[PDB]
Ligand binder design. Sequence first.
Ligand SMILES: CC[C@H]1CN2CCc3cc(OC)c(OC)cc3[C@@H]2C[C@@H]1C[C@H]1NCCc2cc(O)c(OC)cc21
Ligand SMILES: [Mg+2]
Ligand SMILES: [Mg+2]
Length: 127
Amino acid sequence: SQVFGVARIFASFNDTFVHVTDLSGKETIARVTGGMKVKADRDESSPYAAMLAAQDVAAKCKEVGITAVHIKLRATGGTKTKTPGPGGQSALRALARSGLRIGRIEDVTPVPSXSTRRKGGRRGRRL
RNA sequence: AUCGUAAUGAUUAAUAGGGACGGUCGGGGGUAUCAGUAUUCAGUUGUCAGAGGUGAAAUU
Ligand SMILES: CC[C@H]1CN2CCc3cc(OC)c(OC)cc3[C@@H]2C[C@@H]1C[C@H]1NCCc2cc(O)c(OC)cc21
Ligand SMILES: [Mg+2]
Ligand SMILES: [Mg+2]
């Protein structure tokens, strides 16, 4: 029936990666970031840039033959934030609204089982 | 020295303490040992123009 890729959406708070691979992830099909859609750094992670990135990703997927994708959303994780960035929701809605078919959705944010020391110092970053 | 007298001679066990013992109970300690993902670094792979960071930037 359908041909599945894997839409690996990495939504940090400074950028948004929309990366579609095969099932294994060893073959990259399309990787469009929110920074390729705007010329200002402050909105590289904007929902608008993520939507444009997703539309370009869907267009590239269609001409290669990918008709459906599984979703692996992730935040920065590690010692940094575990909540996904603002662009991951827009890239997901744009992908679903672009004619690509959606399979399983999962959050794959890296979470330590403890961890290393987090930047900022003992008193945190004072603002 | 022996013998005879005598009701012959030792206070409780403290909701003080100490000790023993019996099933436990603890992220109490020491010495080994076994996980976990994460971080970074490295090796292979895949694409292609940005990535990072910020209030905005810039160093990179
Ligand atoms: C860390 C040293 C200063 C440097 N200056 C330059 C001018 C400027 C202009 C802004 O607006 C154009 C702006 O955005 C807020 C931030 C700044 C920064 C703020 C900072 C003061 C800090 N101490 C208290 C106030 C405050 C508030 C914040 O939100 C905030 O976040 C980074 C930080 C702070
Ligand atoms: Mg303050
Ligand atoms: Mg007693």
